């Protein structure tokens, strides 16, 4: 479906450290990030999205409109400027972040009460699965 609204709890997280390493996140912060519980909160109204990723320590919040490029500064992650764009490819929500890192972005598949997320950077893919709370 195209409705991603909800509070989403992580169930699976494959190659998180490889994806973070591809982004040049410090080895110490990677250490901590792998241990934290991650909660993904999505507020969606039409083409307007507010996405909030929260853990004990760090937060990552982004707002966007589908189909409208936006400048992004990944202040709480790898601290880079990217030109981001989120679009629908069928019922897959696709984000491309143009900038230094090649093949950067993410894709979201919503299937019932499950959310599949694939984060890409360079040649690394992190695959995550969330269940709706
Ligand atoms: C549709 C989802 C997009 C998206 C953008 C940014 C991040 C995520 C999902 C998370 C939840 C996978 C995530 C986790 C982290 N941490 C360090 C690796 C823990 C807070 C940072 C940024 C994003």
From Swiss-Prot:
This protein's name: Retinol-binding protein 2
One CC-aspect GO term: nucleus
Pfam families in the cross-refs: Lipocalin
Any one GO MF annotation of this record: fatty acid binding
Gene3D superfamilies given in the database record: 2.40.128.20
Organism lineage: Eukaryota, Metazoa, Chordata, Craniata, Vertebrata
Record: residues binding all-trans-retinol: 40, 108
InterPro entries with a match to the protein in the record: Calycin, Fatty_acid-bd, ILBP, Lipocln_cytosolic_FA-bd_dom
Function: Intracellular transport of retinol.
Main location: cytoplasm
Sorted UniProt keywords: Cytoplasm, Retinol-binding, Transport, Vitamin A
Similarity-based family: Belongs to the calycin superfamily. Fatty-acid binding protein (FABP) family.
Species for this entry: Homo sapiens (Human)
Tissue expression summary: Higher expression in adult small intestine and to a much lesser extent in fetal kidney.
SUPFAM superfamilies: Lipocalins
Subcellular location as annotated: Cytoplasm
Entry text on domains: Forms a beta-barrel structure that accommodates hydrophobic ligands in its interior.
GO BP terms, alphabetized: epidermis development; fatty acid transport; vitamin A metabolic process
S-S bridge residues: none
Keyword presence, Glycoprotein: no
């Amino acid at each position: 479906t195209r409705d991603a609204n909800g509070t989403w709890e992580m169930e699976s997280n494959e190659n998180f450290e490889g994806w973070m390493k591809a982004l040049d996140i410090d080895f110490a912060l990677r250490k901590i990030a792998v241990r934290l519980t991650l909660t993904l909160v999505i507020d969606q109204d039409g083409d307007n999205f507010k996405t909030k990723c929260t853990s004990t320590f760090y937060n990552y919040d982004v707002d966007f409109t589908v189909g409208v490029e936006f400048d992004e500064y990944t202040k709480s992650l790898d601290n880079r400027h990217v030109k981001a764009l989120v679009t629908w490819e069928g019922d897959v929500l696709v984000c491309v972040q143009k900038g230094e890192k090649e093949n950067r972005g993410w894709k979201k598949w919503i299937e019932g009460d499950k959310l599949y997320l694939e984060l890409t950077c360079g040649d690394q893919v992190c695959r995550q699965v969330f269940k709706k709370k």
